[PDB]
């Protein structure tokens, strides 16, 4: 996550950046960095 939301630059919206994730162990509460929007649709963020 660290470089995933905190790096030098993200690509544009039409030319967007995709990343592939699996084979790990996750957390949602590592919110600590202020998020002006946090919406989870179809599954509870809790």
């Amino acid at each position: 996550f660290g470089e995933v939301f905190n790096a030098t630059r993200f690509a544009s919206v039409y030319a967007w950046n995709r990343k592939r994730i699996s084979n790990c162990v996750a957390d949602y509460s590592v919110n600590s960095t202020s998020f002006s929007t946090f919406k989870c649709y179809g599954v509870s963020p809790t």
């Binding site: 919110n31 946090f38 963020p45 809790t46």
Partner: protein
């Protein structure tokens, strides 16, 4: 339509909070504010 009623056990919950977290207070919200400082029941009945 409130003034048409005879209410029961009226409680006014007072505090102050930042303008960047106005939307955080509602019956079924989550996040640091509404989980660690205040909390609203999910069957709430009252005015904000």
């Amino acid at each position: 339509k409130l003034n048409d009623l005879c209410f029961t056990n009226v409680y006014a919950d007072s505090f102050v909070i930042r303008g960047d977290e106005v939307r955080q207070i509602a019956p079924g919200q989550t996040g640091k504010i509404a989980d660690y400082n205040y909390k609203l029941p999910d069957d709430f009945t009252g005015c904000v």
